[PDB]
Amino acid sequence: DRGVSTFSPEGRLFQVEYSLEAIKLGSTAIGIATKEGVVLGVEKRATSPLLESDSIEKIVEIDRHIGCAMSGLTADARSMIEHARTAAVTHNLYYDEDINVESLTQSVCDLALRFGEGASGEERLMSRPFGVALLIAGHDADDGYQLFHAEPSGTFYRYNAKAIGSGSEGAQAELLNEWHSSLTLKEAELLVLKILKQVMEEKLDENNAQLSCITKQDGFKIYDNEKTAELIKELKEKEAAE
Amino acid sequence: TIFSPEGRLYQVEYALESISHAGTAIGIMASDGIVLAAERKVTSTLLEQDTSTEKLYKLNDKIAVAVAGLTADAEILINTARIHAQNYLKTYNEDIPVEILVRRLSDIKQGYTQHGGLRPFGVSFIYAGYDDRYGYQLYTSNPSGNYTGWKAISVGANTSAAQTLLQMDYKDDMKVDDAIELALKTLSKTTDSSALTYDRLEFATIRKGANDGEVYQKIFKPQEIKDILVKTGIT
Amino acid sequence: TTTLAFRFQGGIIVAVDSRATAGNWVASQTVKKVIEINPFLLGTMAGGAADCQFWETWLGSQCRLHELREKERISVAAASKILSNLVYQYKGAGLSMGTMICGYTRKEGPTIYYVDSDGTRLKGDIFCVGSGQTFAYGVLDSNYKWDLSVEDALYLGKRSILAAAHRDAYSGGSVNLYHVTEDGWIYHGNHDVGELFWKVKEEEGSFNNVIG
Amino acid sequence: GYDRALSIFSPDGHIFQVEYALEAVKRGTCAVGVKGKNCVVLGCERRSTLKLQDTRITPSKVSKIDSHVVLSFSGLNADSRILIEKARVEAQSHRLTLEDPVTVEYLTRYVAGVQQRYTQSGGVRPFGVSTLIAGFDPRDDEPKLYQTEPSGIYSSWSAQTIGRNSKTVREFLEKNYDRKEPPATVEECVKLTVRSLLEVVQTGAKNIEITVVKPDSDIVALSSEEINQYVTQIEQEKQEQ
Amino acid sequence: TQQPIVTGTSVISMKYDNGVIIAADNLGSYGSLLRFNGVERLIPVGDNTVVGISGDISDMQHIERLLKDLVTENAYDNPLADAEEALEPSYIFEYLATVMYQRRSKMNPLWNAIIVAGVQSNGDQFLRYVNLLGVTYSSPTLATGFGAHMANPLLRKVVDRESDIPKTTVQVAEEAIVNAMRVLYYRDARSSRNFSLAIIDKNTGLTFKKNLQVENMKWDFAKDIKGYGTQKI
Amino acid sequence: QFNPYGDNGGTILGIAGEDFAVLAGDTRNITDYSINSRYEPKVFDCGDNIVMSANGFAADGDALVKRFKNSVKWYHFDHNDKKLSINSAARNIQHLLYGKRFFPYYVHTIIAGLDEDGKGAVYSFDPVGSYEREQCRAGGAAASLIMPFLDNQVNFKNQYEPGTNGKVKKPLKYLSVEEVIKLVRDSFTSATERHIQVGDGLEILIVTKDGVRKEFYELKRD
Amino acid sequence: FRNNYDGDTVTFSPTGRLFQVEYALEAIKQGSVTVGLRSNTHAVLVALKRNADELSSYQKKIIKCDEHMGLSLAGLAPDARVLSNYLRQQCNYSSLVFNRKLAVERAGHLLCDKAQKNTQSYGGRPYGVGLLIIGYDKSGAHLLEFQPSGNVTELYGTAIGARSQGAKTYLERTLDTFIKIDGNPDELIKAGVEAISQSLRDESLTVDNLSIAIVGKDTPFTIYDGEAVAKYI
Amino acid sequence: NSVFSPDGRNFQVEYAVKAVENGTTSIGIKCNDGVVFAVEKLITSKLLVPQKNVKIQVVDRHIGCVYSGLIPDGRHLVNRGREEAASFKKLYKTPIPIPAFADRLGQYVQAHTLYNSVRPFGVSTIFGGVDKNGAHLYMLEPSGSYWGYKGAATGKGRQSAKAELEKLVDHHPEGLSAREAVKQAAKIIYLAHEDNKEKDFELEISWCSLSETNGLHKFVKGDLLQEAIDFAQKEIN
Ligand SMILES: COc1ccc2c(c1)[C@H](CC(=O)N[C@H](C(=O)N[C@@H](CCc1ccccc1)C(=O)NCc1ccc(C)cc1)[C@@H](C)O)CC2=O
Ligand SMILES: [Mg+2]
């Protein structure tokens, strides 16, 4: 052990790589971007049957037009959410408009860069990288529906579909086959629910898994338990009949 | 500051280890007073007894401490505790309740445990105090910043040995004079020296002020310790 | 400026003029003195135009932030206290604002808070604020009953701003009217004093100090 | 000052200092909480290493954060005091600005945030503490119980336990806590809480302490005699077959 | 809070067909004491720019150092410092305007009025003014102080609008400058018979004339003036 | 004592059409009773089809325009070349102005462009950032001369339908760019006649769904 | 030897090497290829963007710095964002204060000095990104290459990133032809698109693969992506 | 850095010197009224724009600097030198004397050998110019050490350059004109290129002369450069 921002001989940052490892141990989070909205789903993964599952917040509202899903050391995600909300509200204060989704993501990624001391060229107020990744989903007038993956490396990518966390290698391959540009919101809802069902260690019901989406017309919504239950009737019957 | 794989704090552990080599201090709380007795660490004939105080310190008129550990660390802490007591007096026009002063002192210790990469203070304290909420009180604090209340307690060397003896003879209905005896007997039994002579002791009481309605701290002159070592029959 | 808000049987009436002045110059007749903070919260503005517009827009931002943080709408009490506490930080720097925070929540019921730049914050059933306040108070107080219909209460509010627009050189333009309910503000229109005065004179048979 | 990083990532993705912080909680005395239909009960075990204590003045393990919210912990005792102080301050500050006492969820989010902060700041070590926060929201009869841990993760529980041998008592509570049927009253909720501790303590003398939280700022500690009557009744009734 | 001490009166200037002319007298006043007489208030920067300064002379000397430092600094790691990356009048100006405006915004002004004259690299005339408040403007003619009230009216008879500038020759323009200097010497109690003058021309470059004197003054008519009304002798 | 403020004269006027807007200003810059320049523009193309003038103390006007042009540049950088819409420009300028609340800019500012629907839009600010969208506005030295004319000739105020015994008002129509330029020129020749700080030149900036166009007219030089 | 000597940037190896800096240089070699080249009238950047998946976007390699300047990146992308932001600030400052477009050369010096402080301060890493900077200024088209060691060099053409050695050899060969490609934007781009081809073990470069940027005489710096590049594949 | 070896040495500085030896070769020559500076620029590829990666740097108006080793470390040193010369002029009005300037650089370089949190500089710098009392040439090592020189070289060609420099001191004890020193500088740079011949090189020369440049620092360009290149080409063959 020597430094927190040392390069390996290959040219990579040790601590950045390992934080990426903390994310692989997280619950699963999946997002799919259609042309009728963007769905975001997560594995709740209660550590005991005595834990009250609806107290598990892994999907949060950032603004009316932007939601996000987390995977990893989820406590690290509080200050990122706080920052994201402030940036969006502030942007609306300064400019009387909605912040673009891409701009919001870039701001969360700038925050993530701030580990160290002030790295001789400015100032870093945080001792390690974040141990959590985010899927950032929303709508804006320039670019429509969008899905971003924000990493503790401060890089972000847009994705037609994306999975993060423990089941992510497997879920991603699945998404590579199922995703096409044409999907309805309902088709995409079902796909998230299907792919979570595959990779989860319990039987997926309306307590260990959570759904949400964002549409231009209704904003960002976290579906209540009764609604998801009725989509889980619906998936069961669609597959049992195929 | 760092944690061990066991979830223990090295530097704190090692500071407690250091304290177990220091002279034993004993505190006993009775119903009408408190006793503080301490053993001075292997002395010499030439050491000035008449102008010495290494183990017993006055915090205000109603609170005293017995020290086990590095004296120099203790003086740092004692001084801040004295200031803290006066701030309280100035703010509220009331003498500081014993617990409050103990808690503040403990919090300063806890701090060194958690941030700043300085070493902890190698000090353990027994506080002897009176206030009008809880009457007579005895508390202990160690380098971790933890503190606890007691009817009788010891710190420094042979605490385990001294604690068992106190457990045995301690009774709730005790007068201070019985506590005086108990403390001297317990140090006598647990010394690593021939006998417990006056020149190796510090002794203090917090009584109900002879005949008054008021609280008085008596810090024993060497002469008094020699005389009180007579009564209890250890010559 | 004249602004008022009062509580009655069927909620809250909020009414404001729309005149902006610098000295004796009439800067605008069409200024917006109500801020719709959220669907259940209104802010009224008197004093420094900029001071009011800026800090009440800002208050909107802070209110939205509370919603995201607490997954619940901010209480009238707490929204008003944010603005109160901000303004108090600035005491003695020359901020100039008289303000009403008006809204509904389940827990509070319909509520009005008056907040000014001296730092005063009061809860009450009736407030008139601005250079025209005394005029508004005269009409409002002498015709106010708790049990007024919604229709009448809307009229009285409308009629009190008109009173003030007429007598106070620094009020006028138009009335902007709002009703706040359980559900909860509803806009009851912009009414130009130009037309409203003659119409009220005709129909009510009042304003007899006026030739014509 | 000194802000050299002590809490950093392991090759396999853990933060070692936080993980070792959990170890300190494991060796701390046990603490448990369960929620009734109209109450919540907090139980703690006091150690037996030293028994010449003065119970009048020794800081007990359940702490009032406000008049309607309580906090207990397992782990470093000195560490807990920093959390209890900040929580108390935050609670007064929230009454000052929002003109309302805190919700139990709010207070938890707050403590958890403090814990999280101490896992990512240079020159500080994480809190060797996990907490149970229990009480009722202003003007609400629905009871609340939350758990925090050195990472800053937090969540609600019908019942939960922390500290040494928490594993045993957790197991006990999973078998014994029925979600449809919460303990209908105070008396029967206290009993289930005592039963879970008896699994770990082995005599429940002055070593088991109980605190009962009822709606609208009604919080009472229990005496020796009130606890003794529970232990007596439990072991006698549960011995026959 | 500050107040000028040693000052120096108008700076006057105009554009002609090929370049610019700027002039200023050589006096530094101490209130009504005509204190110092060799004061140069025309500051050549490179050879395409002259900065003319009036107001407080201590501040003037400060702005001289700033301009010299500016030439040094532009030369650093700049192989084209005496060609395509030479300081232009517009860069010198903008810089000074920035300093001027920042200093007033800190309530601590440089107590001056400044005219920047020169020719840009594309042959265009540059003439612009900045003062202690950071106010800036440009005109075919520019003058500070009394020069504003008395030189401008005269100079404007020659160049009254943009379309007059291809029509004005060096000779005509210099004549108008020299004459306006004489009028200022007649009527400004803080002026001096000695002045400097600079021409910056797209062909000729920089001609800097020193130790010029107001000539051809009319004073003879003074012998006929007796009394203040009725007195005859 | 040092006074950080001055007064450069100067009058500006904004009118919104249906699918155009204009911002006009005289080109004369004054100090006390002297003329600094007869041609110093104070209406600016700020990019994104927004024009701006900040009139009063010219050093504060320049500073603000500069600062806002810079806002537009950084908006592109930070928001992937997004066009800054007129309403968003307005809100931004409010923060610029209000940021100096305790050491203000001595300007009255007007911006003009098209809104989201391509309607002509005009926004005007007091010196500390209070703002409003309006069909038209005059600002600066001769504002008190020109505004009431505009109230009468743009919004037809106090004009009734002949014969209706004053009930039917002249109905509020939209004005062509030709009619608007006519009112602008007349407003300024009026102001030049009666205000000593107004004259020399008139520069008009016209904004349409094809950019920004410039027009110039001589004014009286006395 | 590489043993105790690569702990930080604040330590020389017994050979006089700085391993942290050499390791940083290694992240550039990992980054996707990019090419820059120029003639007398234009400068062009060409970059191969890299996706993280077939479901993802190809991440951007070109960043605009001013109207006359921008750069491409190879290495740590967030490091590119820090430096381009600083460069945007330096460009801006020069415009506001001096009304001067920043020389591409000065932009080099500035980036170099910034990289340098990070090769010498305890507790901070060097930058792990290479940059290719193009601009048009008062002495024409320019291309620069920036290494995180702080070494910046002016070149007619060059390439950085993985497999970039092919493209470089091609440009070394083509030199005397592309240098004269004047007043023909499209031919210069074609030469850049061809140069980048010599660096593909990959695939046939697609409408997403390709990022092109241009700046020159009468053309602001502009970025082409997606459909607008098809006419070059 | 702050670490002394058991025999009083500083290994980090010794290692910093290795970075210098590894560098390109550069020289300076003191003449009768001035100083001449020259440096070898390795042409890595034909793509390098000729004449356009200037290594010689000016400080104030009257001082040239050349260095070998890590180039960024030299630029850092010159930035600091420029600040230090500005501060001198601001207070004392006169441009900084070369000995004064030397010590400013000296004290700064030496400072970076006192603290464990800093590395020494990885350059040797050759610098000088004309002041109130003549011409001066200096060389500054990573340790902060500096002395006045008649002629100086550093970098890879250091040994042969010094040998050539030593000859001139012997043949011309009566002072070397500024125009002669220019020629000889071009020659010497050629005669240290021998070593690094694998790749091509380009020559840079600058001078500061009382009678040839008015005591200002100037770059040798055009006909003077070509003539000095010819002298060296003819004297190597
Ligand atoms: C340097 O120049 C300065 C400096 C400081 C300040 C001003 C100018 C300002 C100039 C200025 O007066 N600006 C005007 C203004 O604020 N007018 C006030 C009355 C005057 C007033 C009353 C109390 C306190 C301040 C001002 C007004 O109309 N208030 C009613 C109203 C309420 C809400 C809304 C949305 C609009 C209007 C606007 C309308 O142009 C005052 C100020 O703070
Ligand atoms: Mg917009």
Ligand SMILES: [Mg+2]
């Ligand atoms: Mg006029």
Ligand SMILES: [Mg+2]
């Ligand atoms: Mg050291």
Ligand SMILES: [Mg+2]
């Ligand atoms: Mg050497």
